[PDB]
Structures are given as structure tokens and as C-alpha cells.
């Protein structure tokens, strides 16, 4: 029932424009858990199967078997957005602690943070 | 010509759903400058005039006069998204260093980061 940071949901991202990531696809919850509990929206990063290897420092690979995916995928920490909770469809899986540490580092790079 | 982290642009955020922030409005560039230079997309946080005081730790106030706004506004670090660069319209202003430090801290809170 509770939406947790690091959960992976199916979500309809369309409509989008240009090079924005669209379609119905898995996304990872990256908003903090207090916002997850009490906000009407969540913040997510897109996951794609169209590539299967990290290409840049904002990319994090996720394996087909351990997570519940159609194919080896990659989390795009340069593709983030805020979604009303109604967009979230099936909960598919959730990332390991080690994986989320990779996501945190790519998110720090993506957003120009450093500490 | 170069899009810099901390710049404030007018951008068309619509269409949106539910409690997502929509409409044409100022947004602040929060993506790192390397992504700003070489990606087709930028990552932004929405600014609204519908409130004029920070309400939660993910809110950062910005003053009507120093920045070039219709009214005292607040940056919503819980309202972030990735936009194709074509969405960016007029460049309106850019945040001071001190202001961007406030934005960084709210972004760390919003995204569950800490370092």
C-alpha cells in the first residue's frame, strides 16, 4: 500500500514532446518517503529497454532476471519527472540497497549536486 | 546562448494530469551544465505565483523584484521534470549563488539524498 523510494511501478508517461521519454513503462520512485506518504504526486526516473548498457554517468543498469523486466534495462537519471499518483499502475518490483546507491550517485551527477 | 544551471526560463508545461503543475510558467534549470550543453533535454523545477510563501522543506521563495517576476513566487522542488529544449521560451533571469544553495538543499530533501 505505501509508495516507497526505490519501488518500480508501471506508469503512463505519455503524452511527451521531442526527446522526452514517453509511453507506458517502468519508472523508479526517487522522491523521499515523507513526500511519498503525504504528497498527491511522486517523482520518478524513467527506465528503458531500448538500450541495455549504461552510456553516460547518469545511467544505471538493471538486470532482466533480478528485477521483473522484459529485458535488460537502464534507469535514466536524466529523465525524471513528477507524476500524479493516479498514473502509477502495477507495482513491478523494488531496487536493492546497492542498486539504489548507484541511482543516488547518478542522480547527484544529473542534478549538479555534490556532497 | 548556453543553457546554465540556475537560469530561469518561461516554458509550456502543459498538458499535465491531476496535481502535476501545468501551464506556461517560469521554471529553473536544475540539470548539471554538462548535460545542459550536450543533451537534447533539460531538467527543471516549476515556479508558481499561486503561493508566495514556502510551505514545506521542498519550497524555496523567490522575490518579485530581484528576479523578473509578476509576483512573489516559490520554486517547487517537488515539481520537477525533463523537458525537450524546444519547450524553453524566453530566458527571464537567473538565480543568485545564495539562492541556488537554497535550491540545492531543497532538492536534496525532495529526492531523499543526503551528504
Amino acid at each position: 500500500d505505501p509508495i516507497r523510494r526505490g519501488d518500480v511501478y508501471l506508469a503512463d508517461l505519455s503524452p511527451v514532446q521531442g526527446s522526452e521519454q514517453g509511453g507506458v513503462r517502468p519508472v523508479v520512485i526517487i522522491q523521499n518517503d515523507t513526500g511519498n506518504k503525504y504528497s498527491p504526486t511522486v517523482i520518478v526516473a524513467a527506465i528503458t529497454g531500448r538500450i541495455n548498457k549504461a552510456k553516460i554517468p547518469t545511467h544505471v543498469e538493471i538486470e532482466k532476471k533480478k528485477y521483473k523486466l522484459d529485458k535488460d534495462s537502464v534507469i535514466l537519471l536524466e529523465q525524471i519527472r513528477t507524476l500524479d499518483k493516479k498514473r502509477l499502475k502495477e507495482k513491478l518490483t523494488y531496487l536493492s540497497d546497492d542498486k539504489m546507491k548507484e541511482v543516488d550517485n547518478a542522480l547527484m551527477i544529473s542534478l549538479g549536486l555534490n556532497a | 546562448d548556453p543553457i546554465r544551471r540556475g537560469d530561469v526560463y518561461l516554458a509550456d508545461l502543459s498538458p499535465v494530469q491531476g496535481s502535476e503543475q501545468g501551464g506556461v510558467r517560469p521554471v529553473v534549470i536544475i540539470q548539471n551544465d554538462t548535460g545542459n550543453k550536450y543533451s537534447p533535454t533539460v531538467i527543471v523545477a516549476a515556479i508558481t505565483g499561486r503561493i508566495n510563501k514556502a510551505k514545506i522543506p521542498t519550497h524555496v521563495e523567490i522575490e518579485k523584484k530581484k528576479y523578473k517576476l509578476d509576483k512573489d513566487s516559490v520554486i517547487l522542488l517537488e515539481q520537477i521534470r525533463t523537458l525537450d529544449k524546444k519547450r524553453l521560451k524566453e530566458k527571464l533571469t537567473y538565480l543568485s549563488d545564495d539562492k541556488m544553495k537554497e535550491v540545492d538543499n531543497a532538492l536534496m530533501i525532495s529526492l531523499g539524498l543526503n551528504a
Epitope: 531500448r50 538500450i51 552510456k55 553516460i56 545511467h59 | 548535460g35 550543453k37 543533451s39 537534447p40 529544449k85
Partner: nanobody, 131 residues
Framework: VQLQESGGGLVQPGGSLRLSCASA???????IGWFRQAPGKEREVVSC????????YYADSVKGRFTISSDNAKNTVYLQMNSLKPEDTAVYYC??????????????????????????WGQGTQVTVSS
């Protein structure tokens, strides 16, 4: 065959050469870059372009001497090389990937890959700058 370079050869120092990278696909499918490699060294970024917009990357060693450009009608990307130096001698490859221009920007800058992460590569063409 996907990418195919042509236009290498021998030039005296100070000369010019134009390399061509013929893409099997229209240039909106990916960004395209030129790399070079000398014996026993890793392939290094020279210049990159995303043809659908104008965006480019140039390595510090070739700035103001080399120019990358697109010919959409011929699905070809060119590297115009002027004021060539002996130290520009290398095998020159073109490469293509959806994320190539960001790759050029982030790593030239140099965290570290194997460069084999980019999807498409030509066979390489020899550039020799020598008197």
C-alpha cells in the same frame, strides 16, 4: 556494413584532409563522432555532432583546426581537418550512438569506459601527417 569512413591518406604537415563517415541510416537516428587511435593506445574522442540539432563537441587538441558537419542528403558526416600536425597521425574511426554526443561531453575531460559501449563503429581510416 553500417558506418564507413573514407578520405584518409598522406598529407604534409600543414595540409588539409576531409574525412567522410557514410551512415546507412538517416542522420537523425543517432549522434556521430570521430575518434582516433595510435598504436597501443585507447581510442580518443576528436569531434562529435548531433545532426538533428547543431550541437558539437571538439577535443581541446583539435579546436580551431577541425570542423565536423552534416550532409543530410548523403547521410554523411564530414571531418574537415586543416593545419594538420604529425601528432594528428592515427587511425580515425567514426562511431554512432543515440547517446554519443553526451558521451563525448561527459568523458572527454574522464571517468572511464572501454568505448565499446557505443553501438556502431566504422572500420577506421589511416591519417598520416609526414614530410
Amino acid at each position: 556494413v553500417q558506418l564507413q569512413e573514407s578520405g584518409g591518406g598522406l598529407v604534409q604537415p600543414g595540409g588539409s584532409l576531409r574525412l567522410s563517415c557514410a551512415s546507412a541510416y538517416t542522420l537523425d537516428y543517432y549522434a556521430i563522432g570521430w575518434f582516433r587511435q595510435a598504436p597501443g593506445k585507447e581510442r580518443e574522442v576528436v569531434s562529435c555532432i548531433r545532426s538533428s540539432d547543431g550541437s558539437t563537441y571538439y577535443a581541446d587538441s583539435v579546436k580551431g583546426r577541425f570542423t565536423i558537419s552534416s550532409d543530410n542528403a548523403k547521410n554523411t558526416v564530414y571531418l574537415q581537418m586543416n593545419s594538420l600536425k604529425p601528432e594528428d597521425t592515427a587511425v580515425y574511426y567514426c562511431a554512432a550512438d543515440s547517446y554519443l554526443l553526451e558521451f563525448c561531453g561527459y568523458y572527454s575531460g574522464y571517468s572511464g569506459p572501454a568505448s565499446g559501449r557505443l553501438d556502431y563503429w566504422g572500420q577506421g581510416t589511416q591519417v598520416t601527417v609526414s614530410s
